[model samples]
Target: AGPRYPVSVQGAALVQIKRLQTFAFSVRWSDGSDTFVRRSWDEFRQLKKTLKETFPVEAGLLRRSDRVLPKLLDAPLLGRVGRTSRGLARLQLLETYSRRLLATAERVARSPTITGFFAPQPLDLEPALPPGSRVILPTPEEQ
Candidate 1:
C-alpha cells in the first residue's frame, strides 16, 4: 500500500526527475505506485535535505543547495506549488532558512548588506520621520 503522511521510508531509488520550468519539478519514485508528484525546486531541495538528515547512507548524495532556492525565495515569484496554504507555510519556513543563510554569508562577507536580512519586514512606519525619508519602526505603543 502507498504510504501516508509523515511516513518515513527506509530507502527508495529515484526513477527520474524532469524540470518543466524554473520552479516546477517532476519526480518519480521507483517503488511507489504513485507515478509522479509536481513540486517546486525549493520543495525538492527541502525533501532532499530532510531525507539526507533522516537517512544519511540511504538518501544518497544530493547536490548542494543551489542559488535558485535562495533566489526564488527572495523574489515574489511563487510557483503553482507555492500558492496553496501548505505551500505558503513551506514558503515561510524556507524564507526563514534563506534569511539565515544570507545572514551568515553577510557576516562572513563583513560588509554592509541590505537590512531585514534575518528579520521580518516591519509592519508599521512611524509617521513622524525626517523630511524626504520614511523609516519602518515599531509603533509608538509597541516601542
Candidate 2:
C-alpha cells in the first residue's frame, strides 16, 4: 500500500519542502500531530542537526545514505549533483532532504529500540511480549 498520510504505520511523517519564487524555501511536516512546525533553510539545518543527535543510531544510518551523505541531512554533494545553480539548486536539495527525512522517520519507527518516540496514536502501555521475556522495571522502592 501507498504510505499513509499524516503519519505512517511505520511512524514516518511526511515532510515537504517547496521553493518559492524568491529563492527561498519552506519545510514543514505534513502531520499535525507534533508541535506543528515550519522552517527556512537555516532553521531546517538546525532541526536536522537536532534530529541527528536525538536519535543517533537511526540518524547515523540515514545520514550515511547517499541522499544525505557528507552533510548528514543535507543534499548530496553539489559537485555530484550538477545542473541546478541557485533557485533550481535549492529546489533539488529540498527535494532530496524531504524525501530522505521521510524515509529516515520510517526507518526509525520500525526500530524496536525507539518506536515509542514515534507512536502514531497512543501506544498500549502494556502490550504483549515475546514468550519467556520479562518486563523489567524499577519498583517504587528503587524510585
- Per-candidate local distance difference test: 0.30, 0.36
**Model 2 off-target regions past 4 Å?**
1-38, 58-88, 107-143
TM-score against native, each model: 0.22, 0.34
Query: What tens digits encode model 1's per-residue C-alpha lDDT throughout 82-137?
Result: 33433444445544543443343332112122111111212112223235433222
RMSD of each: 19.4, 18.1
CA shift at 108, candidate 1, in angstroms? 11
Model 1 spans with C-alpha error above 4 angstroms = 1-83, 105-143
Candidate 1 residue pairs that clash: none
TM-score of 1: 0.22
lDDT (Cα, 0-100) at 14 in candidate 2? 22
- Candidate 2 lDDT by residue in tens digits, 1-143: 33223332221122222331212222222443322222234343454455555556532454554323224434445665433233245545655654555564565433342232222321122243334433222222211
Least accurate stretch of 10 residues (summed lDDT) in model 2? 8-17
Error of 2 at 20 (Å): 12
User: Top TM-score: which candidate number?
Assistant: 2
